[PDB]
């Protein structure tokens, strides 16, 4: 009771933090709620993802800015940019480690419904991908293996259990194709996946309700624009 009341209050404060654009708070609230051991609803999964996407998103944006200035200073004087980029990088790795720990300890299960299973495995691939963006050597190669494994396991489930227009399936395919292009240096595989995903969803669009149609075509436009970008 004190435990369940504690969980519902943490969820409610996460929703309040979202409204206040207090995303670090929101992530802290949702982490607390996840450790209570109860499955997250569709809504609550989105709260978790919104919170951490905003937090890591700001770190990634900062890392790219600092990395770019660092590389410009290293082209053809002062340790400051390197020192500060390294700090942001370590902090980014720590947030990714936290999300990955939550996924493995509490959220990823063989038992769930397909949508939740794919959601969390996609998230696992995403946050290994963000680690890969900042890694460099054999570390990077091993992180890349880990992201591909998570993405591919999610892809297997989505192709077995969801229709080709399902928005979670489409978003997984979008991100796994970006992984191929930008991370794994496999541009032909990225184009193939994105084109196949778009084409197989296009063939089913006529079957969708108005709300489903809106959700699916939004992600399909992203697939189409990436294909335009890459071809």
């Amino acid at each position: 009771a004190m435990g369940s009341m504690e969980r519902a209050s943490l969820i409610q404060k996460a929703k309040l933090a979202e409204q206040a654009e207090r995303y670090e708070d929101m992530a802290a609230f949702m982490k607390g709620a996840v450790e209570k051991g109860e499955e997250l609803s569709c809504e609550e999964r989105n709260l978790l993802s919104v919170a951490y996407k905003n937090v890591v998103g700001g770190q990634r944006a900062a890392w790219r800015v600092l990395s770019s200035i660092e590389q410009k200073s290293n082209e053809e004087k002062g340790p400051e940019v390197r020192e500060y980029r390294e700090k942001v990088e370590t902090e980014l790795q720590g947030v990714c480690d936290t999300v990955l720990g939550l996924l493995d300890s509490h959220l990823i299960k063989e038992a769930g419904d397909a949508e939740s299973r794919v959601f969390y495995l996609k998230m696992k691939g995403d946050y290994y991908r963000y680690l890969a963006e900042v890694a460099t050597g054999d570390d990077k190669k091993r992180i890349i293996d880990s992201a591909r494994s998570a993405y591919q396991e999610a892809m297997d489930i989505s192709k077995k259990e969801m229709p080709p227009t399902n928005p979670i399936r489409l978003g997984l395919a979008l991100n796994f194709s970006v992984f191929h292009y930008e991370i794994a240096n496999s541009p032909e595989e990225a184009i193939s996946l994105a084109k196949t995903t778009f084409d197989e969803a296009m063939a089913d669009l006529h079957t969708l309700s108005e709300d489903s149609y809106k959700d699916s075509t939004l992600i399909m436009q992203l697939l189409r624009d990436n294909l335009t970008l890459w071809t």
């Binding site: 993802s49 928005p167 978003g171 991100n175 970006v178 930008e182 992600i219 992203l222």
Partner: peptide, 11 residues
């Protein structure tokens, strides 16, 4: 070059 789109949830 611009970066490719990724997606985790609708805006």
């Amino acid at each position: 070059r611009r970066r490719a789109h990724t997606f985790s949830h609708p805006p």
